[PDB]
Design a protein around this nucleic acid. Structure first.
Ligand SMILES: Nc1nc2c(ncn2[C@@H]2O[C@H](COP(=O)(O)OP(=O)(O)OP(=O)(O)O)[C@@H](O)[C@H]2O)c(=O)[nH]1
Ligand SMILES: [Mg+2]
Ligand SMILES: [Mg+2]
Lengths: 97, 125, 285, 125, 65
RNA sequence: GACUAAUCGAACCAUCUAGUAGCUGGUUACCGCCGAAGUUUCCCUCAGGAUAGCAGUGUCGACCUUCAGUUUUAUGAGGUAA
RNA sequence: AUGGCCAGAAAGUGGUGUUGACGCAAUGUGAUUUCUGCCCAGUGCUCUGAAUGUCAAAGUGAAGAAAUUCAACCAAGCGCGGGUAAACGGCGGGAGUAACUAUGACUCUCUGUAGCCAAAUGGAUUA
RNA sequence: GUCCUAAGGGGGGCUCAUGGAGAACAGAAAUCUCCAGUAGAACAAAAGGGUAAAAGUCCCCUUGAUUUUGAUUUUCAGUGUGAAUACAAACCAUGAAAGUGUGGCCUAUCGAUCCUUUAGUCCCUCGAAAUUUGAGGCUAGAGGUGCCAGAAAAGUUACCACAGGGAUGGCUUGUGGCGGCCAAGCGUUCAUAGCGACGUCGCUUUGAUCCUUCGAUGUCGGCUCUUCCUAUCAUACC
């Protein structure tokens, strides 16, 4: 059992159903079905949109050279790195056991 | 001994440190028991000083959802199929089906009983 | 496993409840005689579908070190091996190797008689089709030893060699070739391997009259050196996995002929001899 | 308990008691519990509402009011002799005495009431 | 969808039970939960088992379970 | 949870004590000059906050620069009618 | 009985007690009649049983120039290992077979128009 | 910082790195043709024998982004039409076919103005003086919840009390829903589509059976007495 599996067994966290964990959601504003993740997913919404309204403090704190169009990719990469590091820790513990 | 505190009880039972707990858990109450007994206390909305509901009660959310059905190829297929050999075997099973008072039915098999049960009598038809 | 094909290969090589048919690797040593090469060729012709063949010279002595055998088994996903050798002490030797979890489970040497050996091409007969499983007959008193010895081991490994793919059904046209292994308890006994083709003739009854005719190869062996399994590894090898498609038996739970789940209740004998009826006023004299 | 083992997948089993009035449903519940948990009276209709009694941790018992399925072949005399109605609220109870005298043997009546020599029900009364 | 079912003898009533006000399908071998642990009440008068189903190609309406 | 001087899920008397309340009620002459406002922006919310904006009194500075919820001209969007 | 149950700020203090198991104190049930479903051993009760496994203060030993640090030692209790008020609890049985014994796992199987037996009665349908 | 009808699957065609010989610019290095080329390229892994009419590279078809069923395996389920999971079958994609292949991979969370830790030589101070330990400040480093510490302050009041705040509508009535067809007409007549009253057609016992009554959160009454409405049971007329 991994760390998450042990925690879910202790806390009584039931696994999500296959209909619940689908990569599909209904966007009301566009009135169209879109994916939560993947190619053209909702987690990268607005990266290709023509108009992006930004906050003056946000480009004030933004470093030179970087733009607002890559912040979502940056945050996704950070989440991927964290999940991968936890997965590698679980694999190392399982190999030790 | 060790102590009647909840921290001492957790250390004695060897729980994982830092694990979240539901409010009201003690020696006599588990998490699922606390949830079951809190179900009986559920049902009252959250109101302000003037009596206006600011947070609704459980399953009284008042919010209108978006009731939409996605296009899917699974809607236009056959969910349940049966073969002619299996149908004939089930017809034979219904043929020498017999009754026994000391056997009870626990779970019925979902079958197309219109294609398995024998037809009505000639005089009735 | 980034590539989907590599993922498929690792999934195929992963342990399963229902195992894949075993793969046999045919290889030879640095010095291997032509008779031994012909014997390996005949065995590969019999088992060509689930076998791989090496074509180089390997400086391996299996009874001294088998690290190279373990490496080859891990790399090729092969659980059976036929290893050819030739020597002054051992002129024509077939080393049958059976392995478990990419480690050597057990090994047995066969010494082939060079004078009585006939290949498949030496018989002008119709041969077995490619991939067809032959029937098996093991004859003699050498295979009924109560203590596990060389002949029982040879029977087991020849069965694993000639199993093929397990199947629930067989066509009656797949009963045309039989492999007969004969050996007797006794100076060393001779294990005789023969293959016959089966023809059927009228006998005037329901059951056909079977006549056999030799197919090849003709092999005579003397059972040689030994490596028996460790008891613990043998126990883990002979453990049998349970298929999900067989139901765990529960008491008083069954399935009837219509597929309904049926529970059985047990009332017991009715004993009213300990019941005292009411002493009503109307029943008193 | 066998039924509970057969339905061990559930949290418990429920056993509802049905029948005519005054057959002994509440008495059976009290006898199985070993404690007077349901009201018992010889008058019909003592149990007016359904009642849950926790027999074991996985067994519940449901007491139900007595029912009478309607039938055109059933007479008020038959219903009264089966015990549906209270005899205090019926009109002319002497007309049902011949049914009782037919149902009961004569010597049983004589030994019950220490009286003999009547010709019919009105003389007996 | 749900209405609050009031339980208790006091003037202040407990309100944890929810009754479904729309037709429901409960399926085969249905045994109702006991009242102490029955939160969602699906009444017997609102249960349906059959529906009038129309086939768009054949233009035939058949009552199906 | 009854009784304990008409006082009881903790009697009565005096004091700390003018205890605390964000809640309720009330908050005393006249005239004159100005005179309002409801996500603007940020923060975990309800039992949340600042903050922009709008105002009045004084001043001071050359009350210097002029600016403007408007039109026109040039050019965008709407090329849409015609 | 240098004891139980109490009380007191304490006391060379008081009560039970001018008392001693046919007594005192604390409980549950509640006349009489009826009456103790079967089976244990999880929580709990207690054990004149092994251990130092957890292990405070004091005490012991070493280093340093000392403050100090590190080690053992560590009573009761807990824990471990036993017998139960078997109270709560849980609880279809009956035979086996085999794993050896700890967890068993597997196989088979369950369906008298007023009597008999009990020290007159067979009762709570209690005056 | 960009770009992509995503990857994958099936089928078909072709052969790669390099060397030599040649071709205006073109000259070591651009593109083209031939020959020789066991893979010495590419793709995956870490061969001591991976792959050559392919596992490489380009075309065609699917891209539907995680299908359905299960009395079966494992786990769970106070929301038990079971859910997740494994296996099997069906389906699907592709190909002429033999066949091949898919129907996911993972993970408790919180702080970074935080936690743990190292060094200061020529840093400063310990305020009666100095030295050696020690301690504080300041500065400069290192790592990131396996070895970076930690993250357990519940109920009840029908025994009660206090300070306050409260207590859809010119609606409705007598004729069902869904789906198809017809249709006077409205439109349209460089598109012949779209609405459509009136209807109609399908689903919802030879006078039977009586052995299928299907859930109180929402509460009404009774007496006495007066008047109004008509949507008329009776009396009057038709
Ligand atoms: N002799 C005898 N009498 C019984 C027995 N069981 C019940 N009775 C009597 O029958 C009467 C009926 O008892 P109930 O428990 O009220 O039965 P019921 O059918 O539930 O009656 P309702 O409450 O009206 O529904 C009781 O008064 C008992 O005296 C029995 O086993 N033996
Ligand atoms: Mg009764
Ligand atoms: Mg009753």
């Amino acid at each position: 059992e991994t760390k998450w599996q042990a925690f879910a067994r202790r806390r009584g966290i039931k696994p999500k159903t296959r209909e619940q964990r689908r990569n599909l959601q209904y966007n009301p504003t566009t009135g169209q079905w879109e994916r939560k993740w993947g190619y053209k997913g909702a987690n990268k919404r607005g990266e290709t949109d023509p108009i992006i309204e930004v906050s003056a403090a946000k480009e004030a704190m933004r470093p030179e050279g970087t733009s607002v169009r890559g912040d979502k990719r940056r945050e996704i990469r950070a989440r991927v790195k964290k999940n991968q590091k936890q997965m590698l820790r679980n694999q190392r513990i399982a190999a030790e056991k | 001994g060790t102590g009647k505190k909840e921290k001492n009880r957790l250390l004695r039972e060897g729980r994982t440190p830092g694990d979240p707990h539901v409010k009201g858990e003690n020696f006599y109450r588990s998490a699922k028991k606390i949830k079951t007994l809190n179900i009986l206390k559920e049902g009252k909305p959250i109101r302000d000083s003037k009596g206006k509901i600011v947070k609704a009660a459980s399953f009284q959310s008042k919010e209108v959802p978006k009731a939409v059905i996605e296009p899917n190829r699974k809607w236009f297929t056959n969910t349940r199929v049966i073969s002619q050999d299996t149908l004939q075997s089930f017809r034979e099973a219904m043929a020498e089906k017999q009754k026994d008072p000391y056997t009870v039915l626990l779970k019925s098999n979902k079958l197309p009983m219109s294609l398995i049960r024998d037809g009505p009598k000639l005089e009735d038809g | 496993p980034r590539n989907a094909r590599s993922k498929r290969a690792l999934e195929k090589r992963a342990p399963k409840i229902v195992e894949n048919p075993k793969t046999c690797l045919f290889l030879r040593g640095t010095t291997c005689s032509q008779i031994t090469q012909d014997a390996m060729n005949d065995l590969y012709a019999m088992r060509q579908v689930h076998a791989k063949r090496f074509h180089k010279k390997n400086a391996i002595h299996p009874f001294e070190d088998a690290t190279s055998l373990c490496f080859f088994s891990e790399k090729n996903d092969c659980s059976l091996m036929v290893f050819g050798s030739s020597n002054k002490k051992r002129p024509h030797t077939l080393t049958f190797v059976r392995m478990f979890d990419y480690k050597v489970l057990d090994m047995l040497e066969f010494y082939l008689d060079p004078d009585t050996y006939r290949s498949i091409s030496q018989f002008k007969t119709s041969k077995i089709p490619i991939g067809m499983r032959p029937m098996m007959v093991f004859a003699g008193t050498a295979f009924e030893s109560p203590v596990p010895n060389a002949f029982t081991m040879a029977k087991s490994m020849l069965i694993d060699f000639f199993r093929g793919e397990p199947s629930d059904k067989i066509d009656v046209e797949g009963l045309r070739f039989v492999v007969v292994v004969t050996a007797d308890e006794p100076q060393k006994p001779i294990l005789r391997l023969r293959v016959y083709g089966i023809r059927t003739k009228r006998s005037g009854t329901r059951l056909p009259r079977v006549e056999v005719e030799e197919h090849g190869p003709r092999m005579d062996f003397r059972l040689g050196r030994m490596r028996e399994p460790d008891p613990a590894m043998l126990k883990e090898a002979m453990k049998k996995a349970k298929t999900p498609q067989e139901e765990r038996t529960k008491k008083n739970i069954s399935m009837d002929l219509l597929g309904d789940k049926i529970g059985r209740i047990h009332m017991g004998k009715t004993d009213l001899s300990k019941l005292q009826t009411r002493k009503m006023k109307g029943l008193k004299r | 308990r066998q039924f509970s083992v057969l339905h061990k997948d559930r949290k418990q089993i429920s056993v509802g008691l049905i029948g005519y009035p005054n057959v002994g449903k509440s008495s059976i519940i009290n006898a199985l519990r070993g404690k007077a948990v349901a009201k018992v009276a010889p008058i019909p209709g003592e149990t007016k509402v359904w009642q849950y009694v926790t027999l074991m941790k996985r067994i519940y018992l449901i007491d139900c009011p007595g029912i009478v399925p309607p039938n055109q072949h059933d007479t008020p005399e038959d219903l009264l002799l089966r015990g549906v109605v209270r005899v205090e609220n019926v009109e002319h109870p002497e007309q049902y005495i011949p049914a009782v005298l037919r149902k009961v043997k004569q010597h049983h009546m004589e030994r019950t009431y220490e009286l003999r020599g009547w010709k019919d029900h009105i003389e007996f009364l | 969808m749900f209405k609050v079912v009031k339980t208790g003898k006091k003037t202040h009533k407990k309100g944890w039970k929810r009754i479904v006000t729309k037709p429901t399908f409960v399926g085969p071998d249905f045994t109702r939960r006991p009242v102490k642990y029955e939160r969602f009440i699906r009444p017997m008068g609102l249960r349906y088992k059959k529906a009038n189903v129309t086939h768009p190609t054949l233009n035939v309406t058949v009552q199906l379970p």
